[PDB]
Design a binder for this molecule. Structure first.
Ligand SMILES: [Mg+2]
Ligand SMILES: [Mg+2]
Length: 476
RNA sequence: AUGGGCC
RNA sequence: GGCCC
């Protein structure tokens, strides 16, 4: 978004730490073009004269402003999408109890007991268990006091910046393109869950093309559902954004929140108010305090669902800004945050749509880059969604999420000390869809050192997961 | 080092 | 704990 202020405060918030990721035996063998993200300025792998802390805020280039006519247009799309959405989810969106916000419900995971609390708790050595009782689902004085404030709508907060200790393409490491997480205070997360926790549960349970969202899906078993759905259309588009999160303009955010979370849909009046506190935020990084306008704080605030809803409304608004008579049935789409798959039988011109996404401050481009702009005819077996391809399992005939072996190799070449065993059994679950031969190759560097799940066991597990009867069929 | 999914 | 946004 738009960085309006850049002040320097005396007290300092720490981030620059060492990476917990370490090279495994696989690394020496596979030799991936991947590595831990740069977390320091003194990182020897960084390109000369490349200032880390400067490349982290280079995503905030502007809070694009919309005219009155586009705003009224956007509002129309938001209300149309809100309509479909709640039409499918229902309208039992009353607040959750504090107990229910902490433990969650069906469709909603409980809160994480041992993660960061945000500010200003980080300036007091307090963990999450020190503020909240994740057992009995209870909160302490500070929190409760903070809840009243939020009830009063007089709550003020700041985001704590964290560099993401993940593996990335070496090109992005060297370019110091480490991604960051805007850790919000723990009370904010909780209150958000109270205000919109039921809604999020419903979204997770109802994931699919109908609501245009994959949040809460399980690739292993939903690829079949999503795959058959999309192979059903003439055109399919793998659309990429750049800085989706950052490029949400206040206009757009403010209109979605107003349109999707109205009290008539069952929401407590504070739902709209809490979300709106994500627009203009103050971000604390070491000795720096940075006030930003526009953009959704990445990681802490039903971030995925908000990013997904917006994505749906962006597509409907672009199409409508270019074509006449466009409705939600004109096309079909599933998204997960910024990740998106769009499909239609009309020769929709996504090359012409670019400017219209620009009118929102968003930059769309084809996934398959080598191709000059968006083409037509592409089928679902060409796109990526959630870093997985849609391939046909020749054993069952079901679609299966296949990850690129280069990616898998990367994942297997770095690990957090003392978790290699768990991680493997975890990655095996993903590798099984590559096939027997690839599966063997991938884990070969680990054989005789860890327990590698057999291809057969994970395969049988999958077949049942995806379609229990298909398993029974193989027995009749 | 996180929101949220999925194991 | 691990992956995916
Ligand atoms: Mg502004
Ligand atoms: Mg994609």
């Amino acid at each position: 978004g738009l960085i309006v202020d850049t002040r320097d405060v005396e007290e300092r918030v720490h981030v620059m730490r060492k990476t917990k990721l370490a090279p495994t035996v696989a690394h020496g063998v596979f030799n991936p073009e991947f590595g831990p993200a740069a977390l320091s300025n003194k990182d020897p792998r960084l390109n000369e004269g490349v200032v880390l802390d400067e490349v982290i805020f280079s995503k905030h280039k502007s809070d694009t402003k919309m005219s009155a006519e586009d705003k009224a247009l956007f509002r129309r799309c938001a209300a149309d999408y809100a309509s479909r959405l709640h039409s499918v989810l229902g309208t039992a969106n009353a607040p959750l109890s504090i107990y229910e916000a902490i433990k969650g419900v069906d469709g909603l995971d409980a809160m994480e007991p041992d993660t960061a609390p945000g500010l200003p708790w980080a300036l007091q050595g307090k963990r999450r268990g020190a503020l909240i009782d994740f057992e009995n689902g209870t909160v302490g004085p500070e929190v409760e006091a903070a809840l009243k404030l939020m009830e009063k709508r007089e709550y003020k907060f700041a985001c704590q910046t964290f560099l993401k200790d993940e593996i990335r393409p070496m090109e992005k490491v060297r370019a110091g393109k480490t991604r960051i997480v805007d850790v919000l205070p723990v009370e904010h997360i909780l209150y958000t869950r109270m205000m919109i926790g039921r809604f999020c549960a419903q979204m997770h349970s109802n994931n699919g093309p109908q609501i245009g969202s994959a949040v809460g899906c399980n690739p292993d078993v939903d690829w079949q559902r999503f795959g058959t759905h999309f192979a059903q259309y003439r055109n399919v588009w793998d659309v990429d954004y750049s800085a989706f999160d950052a490029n949400h303009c206040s206009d757009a955010m403010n209109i979605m929140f107003e349109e999707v979370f109205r009290t008539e849909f069952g929401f407590h009046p504070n739902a709209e108010w809490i979300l709106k506190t994500l627009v203009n935020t103050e971000h604390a990084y070491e000795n720096k305090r940075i006030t930003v306008e526009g953009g959704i704080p990445s990681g802490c605030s039903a971030t995925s669902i908000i990013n997904t809803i917006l994505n749906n409304i962006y597509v409907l608004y672009a199409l409508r800004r270019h074509y006449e008579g466009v409705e939600l049935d004109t096309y079909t789409m599933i998204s997960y945050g910024d990740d998106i798959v769009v499909a239609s039988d009309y020769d929709l011109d996504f090359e012409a749509l670019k400017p219209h996404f620009k009118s929102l401050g968003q930059t769309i481009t084809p996934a398959d880059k080598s191709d000059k702009g968006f083409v037509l005819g592409h089928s679902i077996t060409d796109v990526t969604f959630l870093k997985r391809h849609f391939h046909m399992d020749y054993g069952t005939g079901f679609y299966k999420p296949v990850m690129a072996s280069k990616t898998l190799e990367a994942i297997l070449s770095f690990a957090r000390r003392g978790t290699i065993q768990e991680k493997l059994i975890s990655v095996a679950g993903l590798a099984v869809h590559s096939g027997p031969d690839e599966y063997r190759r991938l884990f070969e560097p680990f054989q005789g050192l860890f327990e590698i799940p057999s291809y057969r066991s994970l395969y049988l597990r999958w077949v049942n997961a995806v379609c229990g009867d298909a398993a029974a069929l193989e027995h009749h």
